[model samples]
Target chain A: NTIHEFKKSAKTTLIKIDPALKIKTKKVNTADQCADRCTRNKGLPFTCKAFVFDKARKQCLWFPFNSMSSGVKKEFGHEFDLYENKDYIRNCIIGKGRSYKGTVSITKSGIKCQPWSSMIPHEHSFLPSSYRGKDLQENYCRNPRGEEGGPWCFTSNPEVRYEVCDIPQCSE
Target chain B: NTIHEFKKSAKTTLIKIDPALKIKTKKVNTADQCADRCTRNKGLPFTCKAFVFDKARKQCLWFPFNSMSSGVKKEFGHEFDLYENKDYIRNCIIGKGRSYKGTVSITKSGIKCQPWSSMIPHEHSFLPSSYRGKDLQENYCRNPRGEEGGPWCFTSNPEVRYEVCDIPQCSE
Candidate 1:
């Protein structure tokens, strides 16, 4: 999955429903309808995770869990299928983003990032040995030396030196 | 939920099962048995997120998703119930961790964290104003300025100026 696109898929499961979550239930004939609402995160206060829809009975059940959740047991039926909101499937960066390994290879200003191992245009001592096992490879943004601005990298632009990339934070 | 203590709950939803995830299922008598396996994460290759168990019939369904995943639908059975793994529930820090706002009020050396609003034992800059919207209030650890070693704070100890706190990273 690229930066702008993750991925979403579905599996058929005959799982039971809870009454406390009845507020999340709705009557929808098509799986697309439920998927659309979840993609938009519609009226729900919490972020949408997954949704279930029955093809034969025209019923939609929404949930924060999916087929991947450990506790979800399969029941007897084939009319309903579970859909995952792949949009919400990204991992958050931790700390100064030193452990970040995502495929974002650009600065916030839209400049192509210089490689961590290269030293042609921008010669500096932010080498891999100093970062040890921090995966100082490729041009992906990283927080070598634990800089405060999160993941940043040298720019292909000789004049830019280095700049912070637009990596997202976990909490608000 | 407070730090080190997250909340977990379950619901009885009769959802369908997946063919690809058949490797995660097993036969178990009680919901506690399934929950125990998930808590220990057993011999599974992946983190146990949730599980399903049939109380009346004695069968367990394991999953990576929880009751909160969005794609899960409800079926028409009450014999089975879902269990959740609260241990796996956590949010990761991102971007120098400046966006972090977790309740870790101690230095890595076990020193008490100084309040952001206080200027006593140690003081200078890092005020709430320069941080603008970052929560500089309580003693909760924050990455207001994107400190290198994740989130560090002024220490209440008279000797130590400030130190990095012990915070977990998202990935290895």
Candidate 2:
């Protein structure tokens, strides 16, 4: 049986979830392949809620939970990007054919949704090696500008890109 | 005496160092001015050991300490670049330049010096606002690579660039 192509929610990016949460990883040539795999929810013990594709490494990461773990943000790099399942989003209005403001059930439940902001703080940094000496501290999240699989930060520090945020769910 | 023009040491980059260390910030029309100011070290309470110029922001950062406060690594960014006092660096030959097996002094003294590694772990992430994000947060020290201030990451653990490294003391 052929795996149907999954609709691209986020594009070429990684999604953030609590690192402690259960996750399964796979190696794939393209992010779309990864998303398709997640959508099928094959062998995963938990539902494949989200996915991240490391473009440079060609790696796929599957999250059991949807967006809005603690925080969500964006970053630009040749390495990785994130994608989310639209079915999980609630009350989302179509803006240029993508989900927009709606009510979210997680964290900030019932709160009116706002579009993700693309304007990153001016002081943020992006590279493979940081002052922290670790790689990819921040998980991939929604792009504020609503670009699929966008901007992620290296960390969730309030001083950096860690802004208290919530991912609004869209209408089913 | 008139301050001589500061020689360019690294280009299109930013050197990472301890943020707690004292620094003087300046605004200038060009990065050259920032380098010139640091090289002169006229008004600084401490020696201007190094400097970073945010070309796009037109801002310069002067450091009282040199690289080595935990493996001062280089990072790449088109917006910023760094310069170290050549005189200071030359005197302390064992630390920043290409690795050479040489004797050095320190607490863990008498160990042969190693060359600066251009290759950082592939898993690392830079700041959100960096050329990747826009600012800096892979950590707080270590310069990235070629872009001048490139090759930074958020942190993956396993103690490499995380510990406080010392800038080798140079012989006067």
Candidate 3:
């Protein structure tokens, strides 16, 4: 499933990068050279996810992590272009499950999580209407708004309000 | 140490309660009576942590949870007063470690986390200046700003960025 492709975005730059990624900044003189080096993924301290070319400075920046990585930020920059290596973007959580969109609906206590939209045994503000893009449609254990405890949900058991669901980080 | 005491807040009411605690509503006469029954901790479905009394209606609401529970909210209400049993408020996490105030400084991988205010190996926005009340002074594994992945911290090792720490919830 390692499809080799790089998705390019013009006038974009990564402003904040997770430090664990160990980003590399080099002056390669051209955007093409930056792309070639990222593809080879050689002479880099960490695995490459994407690369950014600063057209104004002719600098090449290699990032083991990218916008998809937790706590990383990307913004519009007229002098920078971003090229993401699609092969490395996997379906897994990197940080605190704030960006997790998996389908695990069961809690750690072996109970199914009630739907976020449902207000039967539990009443909550974690509704799909209020929390747009949280994907609260089904009974998935989603940590909408990065609640800092990983992906959790309203337990179907009325006796227990909520519990953190079990999901391993991508690297684990 | 099971400390027995109830901290009272006047003109306060619990607007949000984690449904897992299984709240109970009893038509008791006085807030004192409510406090007494809660102190007994008998016949309730869940362990009593706090209670709210609607003075006008002479109704006592016993909560198995409290304002400290994850996703729970407390608001000012002229007709209500809250009495929090101090004994139940143990030094353990209730939900996703969002409200955790412990001193575990090591990550799940057993590495000491760098101080949140320090940017030696990594530079980040989870700083004490921006994130006040996040307790960012020391090298503890804290879930500042409720990042939804439990308590985590920037690693002391520059090669590694960050990780979730090893800590258990209070109930377990």
Candidate 4:
């Protein structure tokens, strides 16, 4: 559960999957302290995916994930703010990769996205529509981290450009 | 902002109103401390209507009337419990009174209720239909403390036997 470094991410927010496990519950004076505890993941059996800090209440709720995504709605409220694992969002390549598009409001991508072909091999994944949403749609293609067939593109619509016609899965 | 006594309420929650003021934010080791602060209302400009204590965070949030309810939902999370001003809820007969009825799935009254005519003069008020929801239908009548109308009932409803048809306003 220990990690090397941690930082606030404006580029992404964490999503929930399956039974989101709450690793720990305790009082912490500040959001930073809550985030620190999650980074340590000291006694947790699973890797921590995200933590929610209730500023008004000074409470921390941590989540464990077999998977996560980006396109899920960013939970908004004055009482709480969420902190996701920067390393996991930027590194872990497991399960279905993170989403780039929004789920409730499907008009746009949920997180920052760039041209998949131009992205570094480790920075993004070239996923198929079968894995996620339609690929090549702006903001929807390419997983940021986690999973081989993440970060997909659209091939059917005339509006889409980058089709996943021949992209191969991750080899490890 | 001091009170003579304090206690924890089970299966009960607080509500907020307009002009919801955030008097102070501080750390406490227990919900009792939060309740104590709210009950005292010491440095606060207005009387405290309600407070939310995050058990895990040990944080306290106090509110006044005219602007508290909308931003915060009736927090049902185990990590958080809301403590409302019992004196205010029972005595501050301002706007329309609140419903003892549960939303969604209707059930019997959530709080103890007695016949309007038999109720003590200072204990409740007889209100018209204008303040809260529909009037005199059943559970919607009666203004227990905190309202100007106090507790009321309709003369028409057969189910509601206690009629407030002739009760006069508080003489002062």
Candidate 5:
């Protein structure tokens, strides 16, 4: 059994239903349809992580990671950066009364997570809305040495990004 | 015609493959094998990031994420931990360069980067290496907080033991 089945047959195509107006989605049906619109413009497949409602100044996002798929492909194209094609199927080492799984947080687009902590002390379980009444929104790991994100985006600067999340954000 | 062509299909069958096994081949060959192996495994499917054969300790490893793929399906069976994923993905961004294109790094599993000041003045172009260092002593990225691998192996913490590739001591 293949671990993942890539849609080698699949081709990322874009369809332009509109030309001008720049009206965003004055009349659109589904997010994929909007994606179709973007693709039609040669806007790079899966590239539109979000959409804007210009009149309202609010954004409508399509987290293809969380979107219901045709269930056809293993991973989406480059545009759907956060989404994938394979189902996360694993035999979790679940404990008696504990949730050994990772938790979730909000992104500009949607929710996601990784297998963060193993079955450790569980002390780092809860990510508070605010620590000591102040909002700490970014990374909330217990080890100060192991910070990855928050206001300090790890993806931006590789120099400080450590192998383990714990190394000081400073490089030697 | 459809962007879905770029997506991979799903594997319905399950296979057991241990990551600990060493691959004896070139870097790209190793990556291809790992990608196939990941799909074959009942666990997470990943592309090979770096390939290392520690001559001193007699070990070989295929590090995924060092090799980037657009569409991927995680086999964890749950939504990934967002903050952790974001943080770790950020570390990967170091290799990605000013524009998040592909994974490329000069350091070992850790990102290869320098002070921004040096970069700006010299106008250095980013060079992403297949494997950053000469000999990877220990798979440092395997751990969460960058400690030597023990009970808690790595941040992603797949259930495989890792040796600090340089030393000559233990063997599984």
Candidate 6:
């Protein structure tokens, strides 16, 4: 076995993304825990784009294909081109856990986002992680708009907790 | 215009509530917006508790009802008890939001609340003057459980926003 380094230059093109082997998995049920695990992968570097969870193989995956057209409208759907040869992940977060450089305008029910197209450059933090023995409070900032206080400050119910997750099979 | 406070407090406390005013209105496509408006009106001293946006009515509405169901597991054909009646708003929220407060066990979806149970909470908030806001923001926190986030964020896509008004055609 030999260890190999794909790049020879250290300066010019310092950023070189690797090609992760594309493998087929199984069908993914919307209500599976494995789906959440895959969504929460910290190892993932760039935007997750969009992905398909295969239930048969119990794998959460991304294909390299275009316009699989879940028949759903995604605002950033255009950012990632379509693929007919391979299926790719479509739910790409331009930035997570920092600030972001995008604006989500009205799309269908989902807002369309043009991340790289913003007037001012804001840090794009998708799913931000926290450090141990540190404050988990700094993450709270202005919402999509530059509101002074956020919606959560004084706009919640004692009975109703504002914290929730994304669960589709539960939509009306 | 004369704003009058009608009725006298009964010496005998009646726990039984009247049948909820049938919220038969035009259908509304955007229910979450309605709810947000209602909650925002709860600004200083008051807090909005129930909201509904009728697609048929095309209106956002706010009501004082909190009757909510406590679970979502129902025998397909059996009565699911989704607070169609009064004296149950609390239960309705419990069930709509799917939080049972240490009571019944919801097995059907294995969730505290199901989608159908949550359909109306935000629907009732669609009324124009219910609060003071132009357009409601998109729902960020959704799904008590992280089922699927993509296209199903309670305030989902493929959704349309409509205008609603009084229609005397339908009856309770």
lDDT tens per residue, model 6, A46-126? 222234433334444432211222323322221222111110211112122122111111111111122222222233332
State the RMSD for candidate 2: 22.4
Stretches of model 5 off by over 4 angstroms after superposition: A1-23, A36-49, A52-125, A131-172, B1-62, B65-172
Summing lDDT over every window of 10 consecutive residues in candidate 6 chain B, give the lowest-scoring window.
B1-10
lDDT of each: 0.59, 0.41, 0.67, 0.40, 0.23, 0.23
- Candidate 1 vs candidate 4, TM-score winner: 1
- TM-score for chain B considered on its own, for each of the candidates: 0.46, 0.45, 0.49, 0.42, 0.17, 0.26
Which stretches of model 4 miss by more than 4 angstroms? Answer: A1-172, B1-23, B43-47, B66-75, B86-172
What lDDT score is found at residue B32 in candidate 1?
70
Residues B60-165 of candidate 1: C-alpha lDDT, one tens digit per residue: 7766555434455444356766554432233345546766554456665556678887887988687876785565656656777676877888977789888886
- Every model's DockQ, to 2 decimals? 0.02, 0.01, 0.01, 0.01, 0.03, 0.02
Off by over 4 Å in 2: A1-172, B1-19, B69-71, B91-172
Scored by Cα lDDT, where does model 3 land? 0.67
Can you write out model 3's per-residue Cα lDDT over B66-107, one digit (the tens) per residue? 665665777878998877764333334556776665455566
Candidate 2 residue lDDT tens string, A81-125: 556543333222223213322222111111111222222333344
Task: Give the alpha carbon lDDT tens digit for every residue of A138-159 in model 4.
Answer: 3334444444654444322234
Of the two candidates 1 and 4, the one with more favorable DockQ, higher being better, is 1
Clashes of each: 44, 88, 13, 44, 50, 80
What is the per-residue lDDT of model 6 for residues B36-89, given as tens digits with 9 covering 90 to 100?
A: 444233321222223343344456444433332222211211211111111111
TM match of model 3 to true structure: 0.28
Error of 4 at A120 (Å): 74
